[PDB]
């Protein structure tokens, strides 16, 4: 056959039933942990030092636009093995409502995906996290809308 | 691993343009010549890039952002698009727009790969985690 790959890769998806939070899973169909990477305490654990492609997506959904302007954020960070040092890698913010939804008109539904990814130097034993601010606006309706993964270079 | 590979970032010193810098991996044959990547030997390659545009308020005129990876082949001595995208960020608050590109391509030796944008004045060149350009031989 063909030689398998030793590249540390991972692909974890959101738990739809665990509302009020963003909890990653790997024991579902088309989720993946391979060649060293582990999912421990809702965090991806990096097995080998090197350059890594981090990629994630969180699909935000809503209906209408409230008076208070809502801000949705998404942030990825790492935690080093020794001294538990926190390093912030990626973060995004989007205001999906330009103006309040006028009464009398139908409060139409809106969908705002936030993509967040990049290439970063990671160390052994790093714990990668992907946190959002308001899980009230998440979209668990179907599979493939909220995912989190890393690919070594 | 003897596979040719490159991963270059922007040059913060060379403001006003998107000039690729190999030192700040470029090993095993892949040369950076005239801001382009030169394929050292034929075969399958994975070409990837990401740029991060940002602004400070939306001006009066409309804003269009383009990111394009182009190929000048020995078989075809003309700049040809491999991966291209367009964004329209403005329809007082700062805005941020990334653009992602990536795909697999069969290349030949001597081919030149460029990765260009249209608005360097909006490029967050310092964010090397989101302003890069690279290839890897499969």
């Amino acid at each position, epitope marked *: 056959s063909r030689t398998p790959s030793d590249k540390p890769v991972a692909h974890v998806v959101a738990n739809p039933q665990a509302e009020g939070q963003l909890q990653w899973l790997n024991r579902r169909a088309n989720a993946l942990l391979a060649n060293g990477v582990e999912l421990r305490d809702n965090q991806l654990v990096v097995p080998s030092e090197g350059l890594y492609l981090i990629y994630s997506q969180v699909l935000f959904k809503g209906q209408g636009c409230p008076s208070t302007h809502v801000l949705l954020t998404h942030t990825i960070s790492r935690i080093a093995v020794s001294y538990q040092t926190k390093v912030n890698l990626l973060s*995004a913010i989007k205001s999906p409502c330009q103006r309040e939804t006028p009464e009398g008109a139908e409060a139409k539904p809106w969908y705002e995906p936030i993509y967040l990814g990049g290439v970063f130097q990671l160390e052994k034993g790093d714990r990668l996290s992907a946190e959002i601010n308001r899980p009230d606006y998440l979209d668990f309706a179907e599979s493939g809308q909220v995912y989190f993964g890393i690919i070594a270079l | 691993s003897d596979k040719p590979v490159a991963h270059v970032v922007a040059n913060p010193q060379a403001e006003g343009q998107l000039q690729w810098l190999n030192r700040r991996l470029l090993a095993n044959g892949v040369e950076l010549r005239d801001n382009q990547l030169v394929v050292p030997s034929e075969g399958l390659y994975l070409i990837y890039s990401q740029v991060l545009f940002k602004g*400070q308020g939306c001006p009066s005129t409309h804003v269009l952002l383009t990111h394009t990876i182009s190929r000048i082949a020995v078989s075809y001595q003309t700049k040809v698009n491999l991966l291209s995208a367009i964004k329209s960020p403005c329809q007082a608050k700062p805005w941020y727009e990334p653009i992602y590109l990536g795909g697999v391509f069969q290349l030949e030796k001597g081919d030149r790969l460029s990765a260009e944008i249209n608005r360097p004045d909006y490029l967050d060149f310092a964010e090397s985690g989101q302003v890069y350009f690279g290839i890897i031989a499969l």
Partner: antibody
Amino acid sequence: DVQLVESGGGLVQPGRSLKLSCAASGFTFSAYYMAWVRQAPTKGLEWVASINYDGANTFYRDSVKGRFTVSRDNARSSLYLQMDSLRSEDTATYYCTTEAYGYNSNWFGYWGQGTLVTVSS
Amino acid sequence: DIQMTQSPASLPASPEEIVTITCQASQDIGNWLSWYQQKPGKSPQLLIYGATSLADGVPSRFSASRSGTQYSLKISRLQVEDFGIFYCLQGQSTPYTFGAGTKLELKR
């Protein structure tokens, strides 16, 4: 509108313990990283501790590595800080701020009134 | 640890002046920088986030720019309410580190 309120600061002896409270109102408390920031009299600002949304992750300063403990009750919209084994160095005025996150950036947006803590035998 | 060298420590000036405060970063911290103003007897207020963006409800006479590891805060037309101590904050790595501070004083 938006307002944070600190409570529970007072004079304490060396080696004693103390509990600080931060009352939040005017925003979604569950949608912000929370952090404590102290400054000593006639001195500058010093970061102390931070805590994530669900409180699962805590980050402390080396000066208080094993002594302080930050906690979070989102249902009560309150931020707590358990200051054990106090030292003379820990004498400072303590603030609780919101640690927000934008595009590849963070800041302390909303600041509390501040409570005063003194350590002298 | 990352250290933030802030200069000058003290700075005399008068209203309607142009004043520039700078911070120098030990390592690269990117846009994870914020400025703050603390008037006497009050709590600190957020001035600038994302290294160069004016915070919510901040008067427009404030500005900021960035170089590699050097970050500067600029007050265009100085007003009386703008006197106090200014701090710069880094937020990339733990421990989050503040600047030494800059005292703005009315010239005489």
